[PDB]
Amino acid sequence: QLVEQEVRRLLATAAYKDVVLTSPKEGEPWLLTGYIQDNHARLSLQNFLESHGIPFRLELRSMEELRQGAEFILQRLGYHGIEVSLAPQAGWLQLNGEVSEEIQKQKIDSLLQAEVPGLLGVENKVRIAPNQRKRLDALLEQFGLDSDFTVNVKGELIELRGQVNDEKLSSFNQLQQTFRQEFGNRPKLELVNV
């Protein structure tokens, strides 16, 4: 009837495009479920329902609250290079940025779903970050230096330890030039005579 028609006209607007109304029977509250873009939109719908003398229950989630939740979870789990935005589907988020190969294996999309209530899915567009260790070892092997130098990693400081002679010093200098051209100033390679 009329009031239901008025409510459904509001639900046909873009702010309420992810809200569902299940009509009650006699004497039960009207049930509205789904998603809204932010809490402000929820409050406006509440206002509208109350002005029609409608008894109701809202079971709605804010996409901005899902997005902020996901940001908090990524932060507390030590992920720093990831930006969270909305995906095209209701209840879905999107990730951009970069992570290491090892960390990608943690299946962060499903992990975010476990940690963020009402998250229906994640479109994960992050790329794989530079793997400096892997490239260093590839270069050492490519140049026949992998038995001359031993790699010791402490944070972003990588020591190449060996019994340094003139050959090894000049080979190190070439390796370091090549490494720097690709990675800039992180991590740093130090030559260490032992």
Author numbering: 154 to 347
What do the paper's sentences say?
acts as a connector between the secretin and the IM (YscD, PrgH, MxiG).
* indicates the junction between YscC and YscD. to Y. enterocolitica injectisomes by YscC and YscD. about the interaction between the YscD and YscJ protomers. YscDJ ring modeling has been performed to test for any elasticity of the basal body.
